[PDB]
Symmetry: none
Subunit: 471 residues, 2 copies
């Protein structure tokens, strides 16, 4: 009956490999060994999509508690009762609330015909060429994520492209290409500015003593990011067959706004501006999570959005993000990534700067695809900094730290890791059919992950060799 389906075969395979992993002594620490088994199980469940993606996110805390892969700050394995409270507490963070604020902003901008006018203006600017519209969309996502990060920018842009994405079927290659382009552009733009991602902020904090500032960061990150985005755009418009389709001519809407629309625009602009200067108001608002509440209270409390719209939010995206955060917490606390990176550090110690940078970037590309980018960056950056300090080159440490920070955002193959990929893979047509699939994400995102890796180590490193002075 249902025991001989392809899903059943995939489920049996995951159980077999996870058990063999749990049987054969892989690591010399029980916590790290069982964490590796759990990571393999969750990663294969997400990649093969044997069960729904958000359901594997629900399964993550249960497996973390059962596998005993959580340890105290002392270094002893935490109890089952304590592991249940720790993993559940860490699931809800500020980024979830930023995503909720992005959902609210997209809903209000689409419902009150505010996104329609700006969308018409942008589409008129871009032109009637199907390839050019994709470039405009990716550029908008890049510009937004350069300031307010890629947690909420994809949602805002998907709200922006709603007038064009509403009438396109899920089987249309243009719609799938647009969704994938927005996701990949957000992922690439998450490396552009020192406030574009938490990993970038940590990198800026680490690099400030060396001499790198807000200005020198841009000269090395913006060119590489733009080149990577252009290469990804070329790949998307070459391998998706978006061209030859018919796009209607868009005329800008010149109708004047209204007091309610002006209030919505003012609230949205104030929220975006507060997100941009979050580092300056951290002593008052704490983080972007609390700033994400103002667009929620001011739009739901005032009655603009009904409580039915809150129940209409894509809550599966939220659950998928929770699962990603929980897996990242398990990996960070267990010590798997620390052990792997220490082994690599012992491996490549006397090699040249380029070799260390390339090998650590490959490690982050492989790890960052499954584990969250921020956790990998947090674990890895101090180690490569120590390697650079050991190296006799005066510019070794800043170059290594900057390259590792830029390459930490190159993990884009998986459709369940990273907020842009989670948002893109859980976007449905008007008939409920999902636009993209995990297979499509792996087919056109793994090459995109490689392209961003190369642009960092050829153009980014080339600019870095001159911009970075160290000392």
């Amino acid at each position: 009956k249902l025991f001989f389906t392809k899903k059943a075969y995939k489920i049996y395979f995951i159980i077999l490999v996870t058990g063999l992993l749990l049987g054969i002594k892989t690591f010399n620490d029980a916590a790290q060994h069982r964490c590796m088994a759990l990571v393999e199980c969750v990663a294969f469940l997400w990649a093969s999509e044997a069960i729904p993606l958000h359901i594997t996110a629900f399964l993550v805390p249960l497996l973390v508690v059962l596998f005993k892969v959580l340890k105290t700050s002392d270094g002893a394995i935490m109890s089952a009762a304590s592991a249940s409270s720790e993993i559940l507490a860490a699931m809800w963070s500020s980024t979830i609330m930023i995503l909720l604020a992005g959902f609210t902003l997209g809903e209000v901008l689409a419902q009150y015909n505010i996104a329609k006018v700006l969308a018409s203006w942008l589409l008129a600017f871009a032109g009637c060429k199907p390839r050019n519209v994709l470039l405009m969309a990716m550029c908008v996502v890049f510009f937004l994520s350069m300031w307010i990060s890629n947690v909420a920018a994809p949602v805002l842009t998907y709200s922006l492209l709603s007038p064009l994405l509403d009438a396109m079927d899920a089987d249309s290659p243009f719609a799938q290409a647009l969704v994938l382009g927005v996701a990949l552009a957000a992922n690439i733009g998450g490396m552009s500015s020192p406030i574009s991602s938490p990993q970038n902020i940590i990198s800026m904090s680490y690099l400030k003593p060396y001499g790198i500032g807000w200005g020198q960061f841009f000269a090395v990150a913006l060119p590489s990011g733009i080149l990577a985005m252009l290469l990804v755009w070329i790949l998307l418009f070459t391998t998706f067959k978006m061209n030859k389709t018919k796009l209607e001519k868009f005329k800008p809407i010149k109708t004047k706004f209204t007091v309610k629309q002006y209030y919505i625009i003012t609230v949205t602009v104030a929220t975006i501006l507060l997100w941009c200067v979050e580092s300056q108001i951290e002593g008052a608002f704490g983080s972007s999570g609390q700033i994400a509440i103002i667009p929620i209270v001011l739009f739901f409390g005032t009655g603009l959005l009904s409580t039915q719209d809150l129940n209409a939010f894509p809550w599966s995206i939220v659950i998928l993000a929770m699962g990603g955060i929980a897996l990242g917490k398990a990996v960070s606390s267990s010590g798997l990534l620390s052990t792997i990176a220490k082994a690599l550090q012992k491996k490549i110690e006397n090699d040249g700067v380029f070799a260390i940078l390339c090998i650590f970037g490959i490690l982050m590309l492989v790890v960052g695809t499954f584990v969250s980018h921020t956790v990998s960056a947090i674990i890895i950056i101090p180690l490569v900094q120590e390697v650079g300090d050991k190296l006799g080159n005066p510019k070794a440490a800043p170059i290594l730290v900057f390259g590792c920070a830029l390459l930490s955002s190159c993990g884009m193959g998986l459709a369940s890791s990273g907020f842009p990929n989670v948002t893109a893979i859980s976007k449905v047509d008007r008939k409920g059919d999902r636009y993209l699939s995990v297979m499509t994400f792996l087919t056109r995102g793994v090459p995109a992950s490689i392209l961003a890796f190369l642009c960092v180590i050829t153009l980014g490193y080339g600019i870095m060799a001159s911009v970075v002075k160290g000392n």
Copy 2:
């Protein structure tokens, strides 16, 4: 929707009931923040925050889930959270803790209740399980009405007390639709479903969100599902019986012709048997959680079993996951955040110390009545979930500071059971809101406001008495101190 606003130069929305409530709340909050209230600055700001959130929740100036969303922002802004040393924590640190306190085990148990309450209703399991009990009633009007309340009470412990009344109305539709508003049998407060579901939160920990929130406080004292079935089932059944008598004598419905219900005579497919087997296993695991705690961790992790085996098997799609009531989840998260904020700031400890110094020599019974009767009127006016959010931590702290053992579980259990009480006044909850909106055929609303305020309030007092005597005795017999 509409893009235009109505003015008078000033918009019309600036002078309305909601705007007046917001103005009053802002004025009083500014008054408390300015005038010195507590010696400790953190406690004073926590008092101001507590007043603001309580006034927003009770007056319904903004939606309850929206107030819950606002709670973390106010907690971070007011700087009420305190570190282990005793210094005011930074805004960045306060953001992490107040956001890590939102998702917890209670939320996972809350989500499992929605999952269990969806498969049992979508796959025609609870429908049959209520239909055959309805068929067992017979034809007597008093017996049919009694069976209706008992069926709602028995369902509310699995399908919760919100989804149970609508299914009960659906199963009573041929009887209710044919019967007119003139008949006193149908006029018996919509066949007693509202009264049964309001005491439906008595049934079990997965009956109402108040029970889910309170079981976290009941757990450290040793109270599990055994105690929540030893103290709640008899008290709830006795209160239900007294309510049945009160509705039966005061409505003179003995003159009514009814037809015996026909049970759904259908075989159970292996798919339907799968739902029951998993549902029973989750309940059995919850009951024995204390013995299998060393492996599964907590009921929060145990609650992921029904979700996984009902979603990854294709029984429930992604549309059902988005169709869950997430306003209740947000409200519970905000309530837990407020509880953490009041516990960390030290306001609750000071209030409990003052109350203990004011009244200590009295017995635990009297301190239960004085706290219970306040909770009755609070639940009558304020929402039951909000009431369990605000009162339970205070009574728990007071019982902890009491010099008598077992007193803290006594008070916590008594207030948690009484949280579902406070039902006389209409528009106090979903079962009564759905009750008044019910319409019999062409006739208008047959359950009038006067009838509800004349029947529910004495029924609420009967429930209070059936708690403070029967539940008090049993709980004193069964629960243990320290």
